[model samples]
Target: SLASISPQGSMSLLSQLEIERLKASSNSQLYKLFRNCCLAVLNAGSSADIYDSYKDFEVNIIRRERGIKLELIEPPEEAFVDGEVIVGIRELLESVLRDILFTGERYSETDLEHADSATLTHVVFDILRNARTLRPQEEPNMVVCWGGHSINEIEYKYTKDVGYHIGLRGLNICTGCGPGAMKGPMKGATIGHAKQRVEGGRYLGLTEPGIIAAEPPNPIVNELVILPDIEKRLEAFVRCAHGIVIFPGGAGTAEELLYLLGILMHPDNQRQSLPVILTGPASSRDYFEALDEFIGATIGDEARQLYKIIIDDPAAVAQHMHAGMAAVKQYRRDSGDAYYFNWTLKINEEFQRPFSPTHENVAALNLHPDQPKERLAADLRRAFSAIVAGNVKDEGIRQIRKNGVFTIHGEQSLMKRLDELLRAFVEQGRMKLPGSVYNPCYKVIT
Candidate 1:
C-alpha cells in the first residue's frame, strides 16, 4: 500500500473576508505568486537542489465560520517535523499569505499605481502598519545592515562581530536577510542577545519579490516581510532604520548605499541625521577605498561625507551605531517624526520608482557628473541596480541572454572609475558565490 506523502498542512489562525480572498477563481496571478513564495519559504530548511520535488506546489485556503486553514498541495517534506508542520515554518507560511496575497489585495484595491509621491510613501507606511512592523511604543533602534549575499569568509566574520556588538548594546538587526553579510549580523546578534538576556530581540528581514527566490530568507530572520518591489523595500529599510552598517559587498550593496546617500543629500533633508557606517576587516581596506573613490568621483565629496568608513573595528562600528541611536532619537523627537518610521525623510520619485533593467533602459541612463549629485546618484544607482539584477534575478538573466549584454555609457572620466570599481569587485570575487564563475553583466562604455 502507498502511504500519502504530504498531508502535513497546518491550520493558520487567520480571517473571514480574508478567507474570501483565497476564494477567488479569477486573477490566478495572485495565486501563482503566493504559491511560489510559500514553496520558497518551505524549502528554507533544505538544500535548494530540489524544486524538482515539488514543482506543481499550490496552497488552497479552506474557510470556516470562525477561522481559516491552509491546504498544502505538494509541499516539501522539510517544512514538517514529527509528521506535523513545524510551528516556525507554519508562521512563515502565514507570512506569505499576509504579505503577498493580503497585501496584494489591499494594494490592488487602491489607485496607488498612479498615486503621487506622498501617497506612495503612505503606501509603504500603510503596508508596514498592517504587517505590525510599526510599533508606537518602540524607540529608534533598528539597525539596517546592507551587504552582498556573495562575500568572503573574513568579511562575513567581521559583519557578525559588528552585529554581536550591536546586540550587546540593545540594538536590533534588520537586513536584506539572505546569507553572507546579511546573515552574519543576525547570527552574531542572537548570541549577543542571549548573553545580554534580551528576550525580545528582533531579526527583521526585508526582501523584494524579483530576487527573493534566488536568496531565500535565512533562519535567523524572526520577522520577514516581502515588499512589492526593490524601491519600496529600500524605502522600508531607510524609514525603519535608526542606523545602518554596510559590509564590503558588490553591486547590490552599491545600489543600497547610493540610494541612502542620494536621499540624504536631498536639499530638503539637509538637517536630517541618519548615521551610516561602512566597515570591513583589515584585509578589506582596498575594498572600501575602491568604493569611496567611486562615490567621490561620481557623486562628489558631499556624497562621500554622507557615510563614515571604519576599517577592522567591529566594536567601533557598534559604538557608532549606539551613538547614532541617540542622535536619531533627538532629531526625530524634535521633528515630531514617529520612532517606528522616518516620516520626515524625503525620498524622491527617482529613488521610489521601479527600475526595469533592460539593455535599452540601462543604456539610456544619464550618468554625467554635470547633473545634480542627486540625479547622478540616481543614475549610478540604476547602473549598479541593473548589474545586480543581471547577477541574480531570473528575468534579468533572461533579458541579458536575449539582448547580449547591457551597454552602459557615462562621462569618460567617470566611466573609467565605474569600470575600475566593478573590476575590483570581480578581482576580489565579490560578484558571485564560490565556484560559480562570473561573467561581465554589463559593458561600461565611455
Candidate 2:
C-alpha cells in the first residue's frame, strides 16, 4: 500500500517539471538517492543493523498545483500510527526533498567541473543557508559533538551529562545526529534547556547521503541538513563550529578527529580558537589514552596540541568549552570573521575534495611522515573513512564481501600502532552494536 504524504514545511522551490522528472524513472541515481534517504528518515529509530533492507522500496512525486506530494511504498511501519505518517517524519521527509533537489539544482548551476576552493566553500555555505541553518547576528555558541553511535552505557551517560552542562550555559548542540554518543548530548541538553528556560535551543544535525541509512537522524534533531558527501559534511562542521567536543568512538570518530586536526594544523589556521576536547567516562580513560598515543606517534606532538583530553568530568568539560567559546568570540571579533561562519579558516583543497574509498585508493594512501603533517592527516583520515565504509556502508560491505579485505600499506611503525589501536576497538566492541562480533575488514601492511 502506498501512503500519500503531504509533508510540512517548504517545498515551494520544486517545480512541476522537476516533479515530472523525478516521477519519470526510479532507476536514475537521483531518484534512488532520494528514495534511500526518505526511507532512512522514516526508519529513524529502528534497531536494525542491515543497511540495505529498504533497497527495494520506491517513491514517486505527484504533481499538484498547490505543491508536490510524496507517495511512499514499502515505507517503515514505525513512521506511522494506524496508517497516517507521523508528523515529525513528514517534516524530515520534506527536508530530504529540499536538500536532494535543491542541492542537485545548485550543483548543476555551480559549474563544479571547474569550481575553485572558494567556490566549493560557497557551495557548502549556500547549502547550509538553504537549509536555514545559518542565523545572522547570533553569537558564537554552536558546539559540534563528534562520536560513534555504538558506545558503552557509561560513555553514553557521560555524553548526556556534558550536554546537560553545556545546555545550562545556554549553548546550542550540533552532531552527526545518530544514536549513542551522537544522540546522547542532544537528549541531555533538552533537560538543561528546560531548567534554564532557554527557549528554542538549537539541536542541529549534519549528515551526508552515503551514511544516512546507517546513521539516520535522531528524533531530537530539530534542524537537519544533508550534505552531498562526507567531505562537505565535515567541512560544514568546522565552518560553523565554535568549539568541538569528542566523546568515545570508533573509526568514524577517529576520521572526524583527523579531519579537524588536519585542517587546524595548517599554518594559516594556527591562530584559530576552536576549542577541542576529547573526554569520556572513567571506564573509557584507556580509550583516549590509546588515541593520544596514536596521535603522538603518527602525526607527532604538533597534532596532539590541537586538542585537550579530559576524563569523567562533564562539568569541567562544559566549563572548558564555555571558556573556549569566550576565546572564540574574542578571536572572531579581532579578526573580523562572521560569528555564524568561520570564513577566514584556511581549509585547503586537499581537505575539501572528496576521497572515494576504493580498494586501490585505500592501498595507495601515503601514511608516511615524509609528506607534510597536514597532508598525512588527510590521507590517514581517508584510511579511517575507508574502514568506516567497510564496517557499515552497503556498497563497502558488498565490495568487501565480494573482494577480500582492503589492504592498507604504510610505514612499519605507524602500521603497527594503527593495528594495535584497531585491535583495542575490536576488544572494546566499539566497531558494532553490543553483542555482535566484528570481523577485520582490512589488512594493514607494514
Quickly count the clashes in candidate 1: 0
Which of the numbered candidates is closest to the native, going by highest TM-score? 2
> Global lDDT for candidate 1?
0.81
Candidate 1 accuracy as TM-score: 0.92
In the predicted model 1, the residue pairs found to clash are none
lDDT of each: 0.81, 0.85
TM-scores for every predicted model: 0.92, 0.95
Please report, as a residue range, the 10-residue window in candidate 2 with the lowest summed lDDT.
46-55
TM-score for candidate 2, residues paired by index: 0.95
Can you write out model 1's per-residue Cα lDDT over 282-312, one digit (the tens) per residue? Answer: 9988878878887888888878888899999
